[PDB]
Amino acid sequence: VSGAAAAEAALMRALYDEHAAVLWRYALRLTGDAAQAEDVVQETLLRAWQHPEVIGDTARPARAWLFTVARNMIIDERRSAR
Amino acid sequence: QIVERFGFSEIMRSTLEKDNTVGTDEALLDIYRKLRPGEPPTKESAQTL
RNA sequence: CACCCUCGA
DNA sequence: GTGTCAGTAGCTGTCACGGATGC
DNA sequence: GCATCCGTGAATCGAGGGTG
């Protein structure tokens, strides 16, 4: 039924509220740029939504999985971009 | 005890009166949500910082 | 050229 | 592909003034 | 109906030197 297509949203909006405002700070310290951090956060959380094999085991740290996603994306930008 | 220390001044009495929330575990979360907004407020997460 | 510094009437 | 805590620096050491903004 | 707070503005020309 439709309640499930709504449960997807209410599942994301329930991890945003607990992890986006903290993931932002990670990418901030690593970039010193709140604008990129703002971008990186959405990029990461989109991947998270795209990779449900991580949040399903609620009892396991998702935040810990997210930090590495971002930390990798930043350096991907820090390749020979100089 | 706050009234005990700062009672000689009417301005502090009026501050404690005009206060919004009372309770050791209430003002703490108030501080947390004004200092680090957008995060879930845990009693110990605020007690730590 | 963006900023920065020091200076002159 | 990613997976145990995992979390800004910097900063207020300017001021006068008018009017939309807001309690 | 009114105090707060937001946004605006604040001299002119000129020399050299450094870094991102």
UniProtKB/Swiss-Prot annotation, chain B:
Domain of life per record: Bacteria
Signal peptide residues on this chain, from the entry's feature table: none
Oligomer status and interactors: The RNAP catalytic core consists of 2 alpha, 1 beta, 1 beta' and 1 omega subunit. When a sigma factor is associated with the core the holoenzyme is formed, which can initiate transcription.
Function noted in UniProt: DNA-dependent RNA polymerase catalyzes the transcription of DNA into RNA using the four ribonucleoside triphosphates as substrates.
Family: Belongs to the RNA polymerase beta chain family.
Protein name: DNA-directed RNA polymerase subunit beta
